[PDB]
Design an enzyme around this catalytic site. Structure first.
Site, PDB file in Angstrom:
ATOM      1  N   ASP A   1       0.893  -1.281   0.021  1.00 30.80           N
ATOM      2  CA  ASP A   1      -0.121   0.014   0.020  1.00 30.80           C
ATOM      3  C   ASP A   1       0.981   1.169   0.095  1.00 30.80           C
ATOM      4  O   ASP A   1       0.471   2.318   0.875  1.00 30.80           O
ATOM      5  CB  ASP A   1      -0.762  -0.023   1.257  1.00 30.80           C
ATOM      6  CG  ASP A   1      -2.285   1.171   1.004  1.00 30.80           C
ATOM      7  OD1 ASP A   1      -2.679   1.482  -0.033  1.00 30.80           O
ATOM      8  OD2 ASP A   1      -2.723   1.563   2.095  1.00 30.80           O
TER       9      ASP A   1
ATOM     10  N   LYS B   1       1.759   4.762  -1.098  1.00 38.43           N
ATOM     11  CA  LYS B   1       1.306   5.999  -1.943  1.00 38.43           C
ATOM     12  C   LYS B   1       1.917   7.167  -1.050  1.00 38.43           C
ATOM     13  O   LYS B   1       2.582   6.979  -0.007  1.00 38.43           O
ATOM     14  CB  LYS B   1      -0.016   5.836  -1.877  1.00 38.43           C
ATOM     15  CG  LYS B   1      -0.815   5.375  -0.823  1.00 38.43           C
ATOM     16  CD  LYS B   1      -2.488   4.988  -0.853  1.00 38.43           C
ATOM     17  CE  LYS B   1      -3.411   5.063   0.330  1.00 38.43           C
ATOM     18  NZ  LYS B   1      -4.483   4.161   0.259  1.00 38.43           N
TER      19      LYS B   1
ATOM     20  N   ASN C   1       1.382   7.530   2.796  1.00 37.67           N
ATOM     21  CA  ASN C   1       2.088   6.629   3.508  1.00 37.67           C
ATOM     22  C   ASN C   1       3.593   6.774   3.556  1.00 37.67           C
ATOM     23  O   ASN C   1       4.622   5.992   4.242  1.00 37.67           O
ATOM     24  CB  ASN C   1       1.931   5.069   3.307  1.00 37.67           C
ATOM     25  CG  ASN C   1       0.341   4.874   3.662  1.00 37.67           C
ATOM     26  OD1 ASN C   1      -0.271   5.126   4.555  1.00 37.67           O
ATOM     27  ND2 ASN C   1      -0.052   3.959   2.715  1.00 37.67           N
TER      28      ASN C   1
ATOM     29  N   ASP D   1       2.435   3.084   7.805  1.00 36.36           N
ATOM     30  CA  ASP D   1       1.170   1.965   7.583  1.00 36.36           C
ATOM     31  C   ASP D   1       1.413   0.691   6.857  1.00 36.36           C
ATOM     32  O   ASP D   1       1.260   0.308   5.859  1.00 36.36           O
ATOM     33  CB  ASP D   1       0.064   2.900   6.534  1.00 36.36           C
ATOM     34  CG  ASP D   1      -1.187   2.313   6.379  1.00 36.36           C
ATOM     35  OD1 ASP D   1      -1.570   1.325   7.010  1.00 36.36           O
ATOM     36  OD2 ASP D   1      -1.940   2.611   5.187  1.00 36.36           O
TER      37      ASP D   1
ATOM     38  N   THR E   1       4.447 -35.630  -6.348  1.00 37.79           N
ATOM     39  CA  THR E   1       4.247 -36.054  -7.601  1.00 37.79           C
ATOM     40  C   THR E   1       2.900 -35.423  -8.059  1.00 37.79           C
ATOM     41  O   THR E   1       2.144 -35.108  -7.400  1.00 37.79           O
ATOM     42  CB  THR E   1       4.375 -37.566  -7.854  1.00 37.79           C
ATOM     43  OG1 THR E   1       4.259 -37.866  -9.079  1.00 37.79           O
ATOM     44  CG2 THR E   1       2.922 -38.214  -7.006  1.00 37.79           C
TER      45      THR E   1
END
Ligand SMILES: Cc1cc(-c2ccccc2)[nH]n1
Ligand SMILES: Cc1cc(-c2ccccc2)[nH]n1
Lengths: 285, 285
Positions: A120, A122, A125, A141, A160
């Site tokens: 997140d 951006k 933050n 954050d 397998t």
């Protein structure tokens, strides 16, 4: 209205709202300013990540209260959010972009090295240490962050595949490139910082925001970008790559010619020792 | 050598190995036979799933011991594993295939309805109730099973994708078809039961087992399959579909003409009431 828990109150003198709700507070022991993030009743996982991380460009938990709401005591960042420096087509100086981005790359590189994907990233933050343009930044954050741990795919591959569905075998090619989502976000951040505008938007466009992103066809405005260097834009182009396997890593970005700036690196080292001058214990020699 | 925990010992008289290690035991209270699965020190999640499930074609937890090893008390299935009926090119009667498969579809349908994906369906995890060919089957081993819960993708989609990586938007199309892995496995199981041989194998082939599975190109032997009905093989073909979105669901399979057998359904209902005759409490009327 309502009250703060007795245990929080015992230790901090709660003050004015900063900006999840974030309030200013003063540690009673030290008389020093702190930021307290309130989360109304994933938070335990966020505390567990933040307790173990240790980098100057990653926010540090100072305390935690599990009351009628969660209370997370964090270090106070007087410069506020980077978002407040980029809103309303506000364009950051190319040099300021570099100083901040270099730190974001160092922080995200640390995260990846330690098996953490932020998920997140951006401008809201990314916090600034002071009201000065040449300052230390910190990533905040970790609420949506993920741990890489031990994949169930690696365990499934030990067996397998007689009974194994084809799509599981098809996912083997991409598996382990989830961290690349953090490099996309950084690329969208760098674009916004350099240009003042977002690369993918519904503003003055017919093409859906989803179609823009999947095709990786960003809105390029020549007049805006003519101010920006060819090197800065080259890095953007390298991070805004659609194939998560081909997309630039934090290591590749840090090696890019745009970040090969000895002046910018010096200023960061200088801001660091300025912050660290307080913590400084005498040396052995 | 080594010893069983005092708490297990207090309640059960431990006996001979049945086949993770599975031993026969006798509940002291009832003098009745039980199966105790020992796991050397995900097991808590397996207990949590098994405690909440309630279907006649899904194994039931009777008790649990968290000692130097985990001890899981399960209901004893005298017929053993279905694997022991299919090894060495052993071919199950078409009717027996149907009776067992119908139950496997009912069990896997219950799982999906309840938000559980088994993830490890094979003949070794399908148990038979008696040494009789017309018997009740039960799905076991929920060690690799997953819970569908609340996707982080749904949470991510609630936001603006300004900073969202393209691969996340690309995964939206496939998201929520993980359960389809259980239908692939059932299709590989049905093939083995009907034919005596596996559909994807490295035996007498140049093509890698991975390539076989991704291309969904099963080894079809006409002489072997001429014995099997066109309807049985049609269902196989519908489950062994590469696209997990196009692949047959448990509901589609249960609607298939092969399972539209009133005789087979009657025999299952009969085996059920035979098992349930013991538990039978008087009715209100
Ligand atoms: C975790 C956090 C939040 C803040 C902050 C400070 C001023 C304005 C806006 C945000 N500092 N630290
Ligand atoms: C869980 C379980 C295992 C068994 C079993 C019984 C006989 C042979 C092989 C397996 N019954 N139940």
């Amino acid at each position: 209205m309502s009250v703060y828990p007795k245990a929080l109150r015992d230790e901090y003198i709660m003050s004015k709202t900063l900006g999840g709700e974030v309030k200013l507070a003063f540690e009673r022991k030290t008389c020093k300013k702190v930021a307290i993030k309130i989360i109304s009743k994933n938070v335990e996982t966020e505390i567990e990540i933040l307790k173990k991380l240790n980098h100057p460009c990653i926010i540090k938990i100072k305390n935690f209260f599990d009351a009628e709401d969660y209370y997370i005591v964090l270090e106070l960042m007087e410069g506020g959010e980077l978002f407040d420096k980029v809103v309303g087509n506000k364009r950051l100086k190319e040099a300021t972009c570099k100083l901040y981005f270099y730190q974001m790359l160092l922080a995200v590189q640390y995260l990846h090295e330690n098996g953490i994907i932020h998920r997140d990233l951006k401008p809201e933050n990314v916090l600034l240490s002071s009201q000065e343009e040449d300052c230390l930044i910190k990533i905040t954050d970790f609420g949506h962050s993920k741990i890489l741990g031990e994949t169930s795919l690696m365990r499934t591959l030990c067996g397998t595949p007689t009974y194994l569905a084809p799509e599981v075998l098809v996912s083997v090619g991409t598996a382990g490139y989830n961290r690349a989502v953090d490099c996309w976000s950084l690329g969208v951040i760098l674009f916004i910082c350099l240009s003042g505008y977002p690369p993918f938007s519904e503003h003055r466009t017919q093409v859906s925001l989803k179609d823009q992103i999947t095709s990786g066809k960003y809105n390029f405005i020549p007049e805006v970008w003519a101010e920006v260097s060819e090197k800065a834009l080259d890095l953007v182009k390298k991070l805004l790559v659609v194939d998560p396997k081909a997309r630039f890593t934090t290591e590749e970005a840090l090696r890019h010619p745009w970040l090969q700036d000895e002046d910018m690196k010096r200023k960061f080292q200088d801001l660091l020792s300025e912050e660290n001058e307080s913590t400084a214990l005498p040396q052995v020699l």
